[PDB]
């Protein structure tokens, strides 16, 4: 049953790509002040779950949902900017830059590991196809 490794590692690659994309989106908007609806940008993060249907022992990984990060919104005193609060408290995203950079590095490394898994699995499948010949 080496074919299931294709599904497992492909799901892992897709999930890590989504995680890296979300981390990069958070990082690129660390300095944002406004959203499309006027709301401040809220740092977002993916949720990882075991991609196993009920009764399946072990599977790959899947992104359940994207959730707003739990952290206080960064308050900035700029009661001159057109966007402000009642007391001039501009709300800026709660992005922790170090966390996002480490997340990007971790996602890249896990991605590369899954690529190696896929490569060696394909090599083994070819060798198995050359069983008796």
């Amino acid at each position: 049953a080496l074919l299931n490794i294709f599904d497992i590692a492909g799901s892992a690659l897709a999930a890590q790509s989504k995680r890296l994309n979300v981390a990069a989106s958070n990082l690129a908007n660390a300095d944002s002040v406004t959203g499309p609806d006027g709301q401040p940008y809220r740092a977002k993060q993916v949720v990882f779950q075991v991609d196993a249907a009920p009764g399946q022992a072990t599977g790959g990984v899947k992104v359940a949902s994207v959730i707003e990060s739990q952290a206080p919104e960064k308050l900035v005193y700029e009661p001159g900017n057109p966007l402000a609060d009642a007391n001039g408290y501009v709300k800026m995203p709660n992005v922790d830059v170090v966390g996002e950079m480490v997340n990007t590095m971790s996602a890249s490394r896990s991605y590369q590991a899954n690529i190696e898994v896929l490569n060696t699995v394909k090599s083994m499948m070819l060798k198995t196809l050359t069983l008796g010949q």
């Binding site: 294709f6 590692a9 492909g10 690659l13 897709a14 790509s17 896929l118 394909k122 499948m125 070819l126 196809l129 050359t130 010949q133």
Partner: protein, 92 residues
């Protein structure tokens, strides 16, 4: 044909009174392999087109799977031909 439809109704009457194969399996396997290869190729062309939602990960993995399936078909053909040559070599 008119006579062909006559034959169809005749076979239906035959079924009334009365009341898949190796070549078929090989044809099914060839169709499955070709369909997988065409699906991978179409997804690759869609990605090269720039259409949203198609990820490079899926393209590359599907190309990998299509290559493995093609190699499986090649091996099956090789053996099958070898077995046919062995059978035809039998002296009667």
């Amino acid at each position: 044909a008119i006579q062909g439809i006559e034959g169809v109704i005749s076979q239906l009457q035959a079924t009334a009174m009365a009341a898949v194969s190796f070549a078929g399996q090989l044809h099914a396997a060839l169709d499955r392999i070709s369909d997988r290869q065409a699906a991978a190729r179409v997804q690759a062309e869609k990605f090269t087109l720039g259409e949203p939602g198609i990820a490079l990960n899926d393209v590359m993995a599907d190309m990998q799977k299509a290559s493995v399936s093609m190699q499986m078909g090649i091996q099956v053909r090789n053996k099958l031909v070898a077995a046919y040559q062995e059978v035809m070599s039998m002296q009667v």
